[PDB]
């Protein structure tokens, strides 16, 4: 009806059955080979895990349960005054495989608003963190400290059937998603507003809107930005560091809190979630190296020299994406209908027309197209969100949606310990000989 | 004058060359397949990564740089009036591939003494944690917050050359290893000793003994147990959840504190490290519902009630080991020397004769044999460390040695971001149909 | 030595040349159409005039000589122990197109101190006005009567060259700006403080602080509010009623006093500046017929009663803005810093969440978002300035800055008499039929 748990309960047997038969008939099918190079190259090209909530096509980009981002923009419920998709409705889609109705989304906003609550020990810890503790470290530590609230951990300690793991993973994941904006906003306010009162949860407002209120922003357009941002950074299949971390840690039956916190330690990695910032610091420098205004000739020229110094243009390229990221596209659409005459945004666009043709001619790109992180920084900066070290925290809150939707499914489907076999160089040489 | 950083400096270029040559000749060589079953079954027997410090043979158990546990028990230096191997020396071995001298180990003990010091914010955080936040959570949280002290994070922001990454990891790894007993003991004292403050570092003591001093123990044989415990838990190849988590998070260039804290979130999972706590809960439960010395048919009953309830027997089974874990045997060796008659040990021994024939007949176990977690807890209990909820913290402290040894090498060898491909069931069903 | 008149002298010939060249090449270029609907609908979206000092983007809001409000908040000089931008500096920017130095602003503050002095006839007139003559009327009347002091009127009678018009406008504009707080404060004291005479000018204070001193306020944060208030109200392009009135009247070569006094007659219209008074009347009314903190459905009721009575919601909608006014957001920023919990502010915030979804569904609003007038009044009320009928006077004092900055330029550039063609309905019906 409206209760998401009940809808999910109904789906799991079906999906259990679908997989049982699949594996019966096709369990022994070879889907891929493993080379020495792949073992050294971070499992690049390896089909390593089943992840249900989203799949990243090299060419077309991310699909959430089959739906492209444009399709989500159209089908997923919006706020009443709204153009952008609510993350509530995305989460529903990932969980159910089905586009929610307005009522179902309405229901979920209120579910989340009611679960939004921090215990004193976490509030205290955050309030006591020094200012030189990075926001992703505060988030990670705080979510870890939240596992004192874990239903799944408690229930497992008391013994419980394997068949029932998913129900308590569901309640914990719902609690954590609920609480995350409270943690993330306490960190912002503590760091960047001298500790002012994060403020209330409006039980009739959507999750993003309570978040932007708690951050201390009001522009409806910033709330619309946050709706889109939380929606599109939600999931990116199972192989990205943060998603994989959550899956790997979760497979040992660590609870959602621990699984998510580990994922945030992955997201905090420069090669993962700290790119949005690298981009902005690179854009910033660039506009102060060839002036604010720059013609397509002199910009093209900067890019070629950049590349000749043995240096890459940040926010371009990807591990798996082989074409323009639809997450970039949608941010660009937002930019050009909302802040087309922003200086920093003009540069980002100017690179959009010039950088792809370069890189191609250089050859060493594989993906000469932009990723999400090429665009996200300038948008946040435009609305007043100038504190760049905090940007990944927004990415984190978003990613909880995807990784926790899947965590619920992993445990419902009885996925086991993730535990591959390793080899040393010495050993791998010997194996090769024999 | 001994300096492990200088030995590393020599060794790294040699291994870089070798791996370059090896990949030159064998990079394209197939070393295995991927099946559907593997993808659904947590990558079981998929050869997913290179990990240098230790390798697990299914048949023979763990080797550390080629050396068995028995070999390490004989070859590795010891404390002067001691019999068990110093964990310092194992770390040396893991890092260099060379058995250390007495002098090298002495140096390492002194090095970890000197870098042992906690910042006041971490002190503050630990002192304020509630008694119902699980020790592993306190540990992970505290280690995440230590990342404020990370030299790697700091240097990476400033654009440090990739050729320098390993030196920074080394420095952070040495610091964290040095600090770890400090954190672990404060958690112990705070939870279980009303926050006594006895806990200093003697600069002429080895790491294990300084640890047991801070825990408030005096028995020489507890210190020897601790030395062995920390040595044997140190590393178990790269495909275990904690090692793999560390590897994954560190491949994103997260610093050693973040990589270790995520590792601990994985180690805290019931199907991983937390099993050493769960074993003693399960033992306590069976003793309450039995005598202290039950018949073999009554043990079979208790085990059967566990298995028919959709629960696992803690400490039994393994993803890769296909016989008894040598870390189990070696702990058996210690008990039979030092506490052969202890009642809980007779039970543990008792279960060895019973549990494996069950499990085989239950069918849901490729391996019916015990792992290290089946045996650790009873040794601790004997010496008065009855706090079962603390047991995984000791495991965590030990497992730092292995994962950080490798992390140094991962960075030294330029291993890239770990990013496998995932598929959905729907996506997989279509891939097998084309 | 700073002198704004000398900077102007340099800048004017450059802009004259540029506009001559531009018209030479593009004078005949079509920039838009006129429709019947436009003619009936108060010229909505008809591009009717050149106005140099500020431009309103529908999407992004106001820019002052290219600079956004956030940019001005950062870049414009401030009082020493202050955070908000000095209106002196905005005037500088409007006039020169250049952000001023601290020194330039200091000079301007000193200049406006020195020219602050009212003639006794204006003193006489204000002192004799009855308490039921609206503050805006007193202001407009008093400014009309100041035209006795006009250097432009005097010089124009004597046949002064058209090349000298801008210098005279400059001198009169500087005098009027200097005098304005003097007039405004006498009105305030006479109406609401029994005619106390405290009101001197400190020659080393900025314009805003001298204003708040004469109003009888002492709170440092009221003075900061005043500085921000006067900065953000300063200019809103040339097509708003007050700016356009000033432009129209001044195109007839009426002097700055006459042009400003007519502007104020327009600013006093309910659908313009008087909205900032009407908002607080409407709030007072809703609080009387509600609690102090009503439900969302009870607010919707009150708004609906307003709209079904053929009345507008004050402070909502705009002819050109198609999102939230940044002058609204910036005032929200101030309140959340300084008075976040004030009851009337919660209401104002409350209405932000409600009013825009109504209005959209009512249909008679192209723009459902609030303007600056929705928010000004609650900030004033907080500091004790409860006299809602006075509120548009502050707006008027601020809007002098923009309209007089432009007037200087209009005259400098030789803009002619504004004289469009009108038609009757009958005449229009026949024009569309041929």
A216 neighbourhood in chain C, CB within 8 Å: 336
Listed in order, strand segments (DSSP E) in C229-329 are none
C109: which 2 tokens?
């503050």
B393: which 2 tokens?
């913290």
Closest residue by Cα to residue A245 from A404, A424, A372, A397: A404
DSSP, res A390: G
Are A54 and A65 a contacting pair, CB within 8 Å? Answer: yes
The Cα of B324 is separated from the nearest Cα of chain A by a number of Å equal to 18
> Coil, strand or helix: which one is A324?
coil
Distance CA B334, CA B289 (A): 28
Distance CA A307, CA A288 (A): 19
The Cα of B383 is separated from the nearest Cα of chain A by a number of Å equal to 25
Which residue in B has a C-alpha nearest to residue A52's C-alpha?
B424
DSSP string of C391-421? HHHHHHHHHHHHHHHHHHHHHHTT-------
B268, B309, B418 member nearest A258 (Cβ): B268
Angle made by CA atoms C408, C414, C418, in degrees to the nearest 5: 95
A417 neighbourhood in chain B, CB within 8 Å: 42, 241, 271-272, 319
B125, B244, B269 member nearest A125 (Cβ): B125
The Cα of A123 is separated from the nearest Cα of chain C by a number of Å equal to 21
A421, B320: Cβ pair inside 8 Å? yes
Are A153 and A183 a contacting pair, CB within 8 Å? Answer: no
Count Cβ atoms within 10 A of the Cβ of residue C341 and give its class: 0-12 exposed, 13-18 middle, 19 or more buried: exposed
Residues in chain C: 434
Tell me if chain C has a CB within 8 Å of the CB of A121: no
Tell me if chain B has a CB within 8 Å of the CB of A241: yes
Distance CA A80, CA C320 (A): 23
A340, C296: Cβ pair inside 8 Å? no
Tell me if chain A has a CB within 8 Å of the CB of B46: yes
B418, A244: Cβ pair inside 8 Å? yes
A100: which 2 tokens?
């929610």
A30, B33: Cβ pair inside 8 Å? yes
Which residue in C has a C-alpha nearest to residue A222's C-alpha?
C324
Count Cβ atoms within 10 A of the Cβ of residue C70 and give its class: 0-12 exposed, 13-18 middle, 19 or more buried: middle
B157: which 2 tokens?
């922001």
Q: Which of A209, A233, A318, A375 is catalytic?
A: A318
C-alpha C142 chain-centroid distance: 18
Is B189 labelled as part of a ligand binding site?
no
Count Cβ atoms within 10 A of the Cβ of residue B218 and give its class: 0-12 exposed, 13-18 middle, 19 or more buried: exposed
Distance CA A260, CA A263 (A): 5
Are A239 and A48 a contacting pair, CB within 8 Å? Answer: yes
Select the residue from A197, A204, A219, A379 to test the C interface by mutation, using most C Cβ atoms within 10 A: A219
B372: which 2 tokens?
């290290």
Tell me if chain C has a CB within 8 Å of the CB of A218: yes
Closest residue by Cα to residue B52 from B67, B64, B60: B64
DSSP, res B99: P
B253: which 2 tokens?
């260039």
Tell me if chain C has a CB within 8 Å of the CB of A194: no
Beta bridge partners of A421: B47
A262, A319, A420 member nearest B265 (Cβ): A262
Distance CA B136, CA B429 (A): 40
The Cα of A390 is separated from the nearest Cα of chain B by a number of Å equal to 15
Q: How many residue pairs from chains A and B have C-beta atoms closer than 8 A?
A: 398
For A125, the enclosing helix (H) or strand (E) is helix A120-128
Secondary structure string (H, E, C) spanning chain B: CCCHHHHHHHHHHHHHHHHHHHHHHHCCCEEEEEEHHHHHCCCCCCEEEECCCEEEECCCEEEECCECHHHHHHHCCECCCCCCECHHHHHHHHHHCCCCCHHHHHHHHHHHHHCCCCCHHHHHHHHHCCCCCCHHHHHHHHHHHHHHHCHHHHHHHCCCCHHHHHHHHHHHHHHHHHHHHHHHHHHHHHHHCCCCCCCCCCCCCCHHHHHHHHHCCCCHHHHHHHHHHHHHCCCCCCCCHHHHHHHHHHHCCCCHHHHHHHHHHHHCCCCCCCHHHHHHHHHHHHHHCCCCCCCHHHHHHHHHHHHHCCCCCCCECCCCCCCCCHHHHHHHHHHHHHCCCCHHHHHHHHHHHHCCHHHHCCCCCCCCCECCHHHHHHHHHHCCCCCHHHHHHHHHHHHHHHHHHHHHHHHHCCCCCCCCEEECHHHHHHHCCC
Is C419 labelled as part of a ligand binding site?
yes
For chain B positions 137-176, those within 8 Å of chain A (CB to CB) are 137, 140-142, 144-145, 147-148, 153, 156
For chain B positions 84-113, those within 8 Å of chain A (CB to CB) are none
Count the neighbouring beta carbons within 10 Å of the beta carbon of residue A131: 7
A376: which 2 tokens?
């996200």
Beta bridge partners of A56: A62
Whether A373 is a known active-site residue: answer yes
Tell me if chain A has a CB within 8 Å of the CB of C323: yes
CA distances from A387 to A187, A192, A405 (A): 12, 8, 29
Closest residue by Cα to residue C369 from C40, C38, C44, C59: C59
Tell me if chain C has a CB within 8 Å of the CB of A216: yes
Residues in chain A: 434
B28, B121, B262 member nearest A265 (Cβ): B262
Is C327 labelled as part of a ligand binding site?
yes
A415, B320: Cβ pair inside 8 Å? no
Chains that touch C (3 or more CB pairs under 8 A): A
Distance CA A231, CA C79 (A): 43
- Solving technique for this entry? X-ray
C296 neighbourhood in chain A, CB within 8 Å: 204
Are C24 and C418 a contacting pair, CB within 8 Å? Answer: no
Which residue in A has a C-alpha nearest to residue C326's C-alpha?
A219
Closest residue by Cα to residue B72 from B82, B81, B58, B62: B62
DSSP, res A34: E
Query: Which residues of C belong to the active site?
Result: 272, 318, 373
Distance CA A72, CA B161 (A): 42
Distance CA C264, CA A178 (A): 51
Query: Would you tell me the crossing angle of helices B87-96 and B220-232 to the nearest 10 degrees?
Result: 20
Q: What is the largest CA-CA distance in chain B?
A: 67
A204 neighbourhood in chain C, CB within 8 Å: 296
A221, C323: Cβ pair inside 8 Å? yes
Are A231 and A72 a contacting pair, CB within 8 Å? Answer: yes
- Provide Rg for chain C, Cα atoms: 22
- A199's CB contacts (< 8 A; 6+ apart) are A213, A214, C340
In the numeric block, the tokens 């601290």 are attached to: C102
Closest residue by Cα to residue B415 from A43, A219, C67, A209: A43
Torsion angles phi and psi, residue C260, rounded to 5: -70, -45
For A159, the enclosing helix (H) or strand (E) is none
Select the residue from B255, B422, B430, B432 to test the A interface by mutation, using most A Cβ atoms within 10 A: B422
DSSP, res A84: S
Count the neighbouring beta carbons within 10 Å of the beta carbon of residue A363: 8
């Amino acid at each position: 009806s409206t209760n998401l748990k009940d809808i999910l309960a109904d789906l799991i047997p079906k999906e259990q059955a679908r997989i049982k038969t699949f594996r019966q008939q096709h369990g022994k099918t070879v889907v891929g080979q493993i080379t020495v190079d792949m073992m050294y190259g971070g499992m690049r090209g390896m089909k390593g895990l089943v992840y249900e909530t989203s799949v990243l096509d090299p060419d077309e980009g991310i699909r959430f349960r089959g739906f492209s981002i444009p399709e989500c923009q159209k089908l997923l419920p919006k706020a009443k005054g709204g153009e952008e998709p609510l993350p509530e409705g995305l989460f529903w889609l990932l969980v159910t495989g089905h586009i929610p109705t307005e009522e179902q989304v309405s229901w979920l906003s209120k579910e989340w608003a009611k679960r939004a609550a921090l215990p004193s020990h976490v509030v205290t810890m955050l309030d006591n963190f020094p200012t030189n503790l990075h926001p992703m470290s505060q988030l990670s530590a705080a979510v870890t400290a939240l596992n004192s609230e874990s239903n799944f951990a408690r229930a497992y300690a008391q013994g419980i059937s394997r068949t029932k793991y998913w129900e308590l993973i569901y309640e914990d994941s719902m609690d954590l998603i609920a609480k995350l904006p409270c943690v993330a906003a306490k960190i912002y306010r503590n760091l960047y507003r001298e500790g002012s009162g994060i403020g209330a949860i409006d039980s009739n407002l959507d999750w993003s809107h309570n978040f932007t209120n708690m951050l201390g922003y009001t522009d409806h357009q910033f709330t619309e930005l946050t709706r889109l941002y939380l929606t599109i950074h939600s999931d990116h299949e199972g192989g990205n560091v943060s998603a994989h971390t959550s899956h790997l840690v979760g497979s040992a039956l660590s609870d959602p809190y621990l699984s998510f916190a580990a994922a945030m330690n992955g997201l905090a990695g420069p090669l993962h979630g700290l790119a949005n910032q690298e981009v902005l610091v690179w854009l910033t420098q660039l506009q102060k190296e060839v002036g604010k205004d720059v013609s397509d000739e002199k910009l093209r020229d900067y890019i070629w020299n950049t590349l000749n110094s043995g240096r890459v243009v940040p926010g371009y390229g990807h591990a798996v994406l082989r074409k323009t990221d639809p997450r970039y596209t949608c941010q660009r659409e937002f930019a050009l209908k909302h802040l087309p005459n922003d200086p920093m945004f003009k540069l980002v666009a100017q690179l959009y027309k010039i950088v792809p043709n370069v890189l191609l001619e250089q050859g060493k790109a594989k993906n000469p197209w932009p990723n999400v992180d090429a665009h996200s920084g300038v948008l946040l900066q435009y609305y007043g969100m100038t504190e760049m070290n905090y940007y990944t925290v927004l990415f984190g809150v978003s990613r909880a949606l995807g990784v926790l939707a899947q965590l619920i499914w992993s445990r419902a489907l009885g996925f086991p310990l993730e535990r591959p076999k390793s080899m040393s160089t010495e050993g791998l040489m010997k194996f090769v000989d024999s």
